[model samples]
Target: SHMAGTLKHVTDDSFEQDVLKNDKPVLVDFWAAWCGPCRQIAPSLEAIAAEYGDKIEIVKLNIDENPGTAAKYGVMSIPTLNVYQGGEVAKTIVGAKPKAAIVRDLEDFIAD
Candidate 1:
């Protein structure tokens, strides 16, 4: 409960349906509590969650708690932002980045 605005939380069990099979694009942030980089980009994601609330689905999956999904997805790095469309990974952004950079890099997915 990070009060991440429109940002939703997902676990191992919900990953497939909530993200993989989602009708709209899904942005899943793979992070861990101890990762400082994870925290750095969280607010940016949260803002994007609010900004893009209707167009795309923004969610977070804790690698520490939800190792099953993270492992299955081969999320080797923390603070990985994976955007999914049509039940497939459309793009991946590794490491923490500025909000502008994040949005710009994923603009193609975010925009129609």
Candidate 2:
């Protein structure tokens, strides 16, 4: 079976219902197709999505395609990982970090 273990895509239209209103903490990857840094962090995000699927939700939003949500969130840079919980942004991670670093950063939210 093709399990849904990869990072999902989100758009301006579904930002609210898919992200803010989600039951679990959502890591929103604000990126653009031309962003090298965004691509650099892709593997790390995929690893997280596979390992922590039960703990958090990982989704990607193309800033080029969906500018509304990106602008609303003040995402001036690409590859901004915004952790949203309970309808608000609880944490913000910028740049292309390593898997260990990203995991460390999300420790608080994903930790038991």
Candidate 3:
């Protein structure tokens, strides 16, 4: 399912304010409706949003609907997870993986 859970949605118009300028670190999922890999990790991302929401802002951007931001960030593939901090991308996770693996990739950034 494509249910976003606690993850918020961001468009090109709102990307700067909602993501780049957010006080908390932001995880932006670049996805599309037809991308199977994108859906595969939806649940994991939703769980992450619920678990680490306080320390990070989790959001999703549909590449098909909002291509501007995706192109700006050079997202060539679906299911790209970008960690944005201090108005720039701190890390990028590409492709689908298990929830634990995804969490591991984010540990360094989220760890206090």
Q: Among these predicted structures, which one has the highest lDDT?
A: 2
lDDT of 1 by residue, 36-98 (tens): 999999889888877766667789999989988888779988899999999888999999999
Best by TM-score: 2
Q: By summed lDDT, which 10 consecutive residues of candidate 2 come out lowest?
A: 1-10
Q: Which pairs of residues collide in model 2?
A: none
Report, for all candidates in order, the number of backbone clashes.
Answer: 0, 0, 0
Q: Candidate 3: where are CA atoms >4 Å away?
A: 1-5
- Tens-digit lDDT string for candidate 3 (1-112): 2223356789999999899898988999999989999999998887887777767778999999998899999999889999999999998999988899999999976665
Clashes of 1: 0
Cα displacement (Å) at residue 36, model 3: 0.6
Which stretches of model 2 miss by more than 4 angstroms? Answer: 1-4
lDDT comparing candidate 3 with the true structure: 0.87
Question: What does candidate 1 score in Cα RMSD to the true structure?
Answer: 3.1
Per-residue lDDT tens digits for candidate 2, residues 11-101, read 9999889998999899999998899999999888888887888888899999999988989999998799999999999999988899999
Q: Estimate the overall C-alpha local distance difference test score of candidate 2.
A: 0.89
lDDT of 3 at 85: 96
lDDT of 1: 0.86
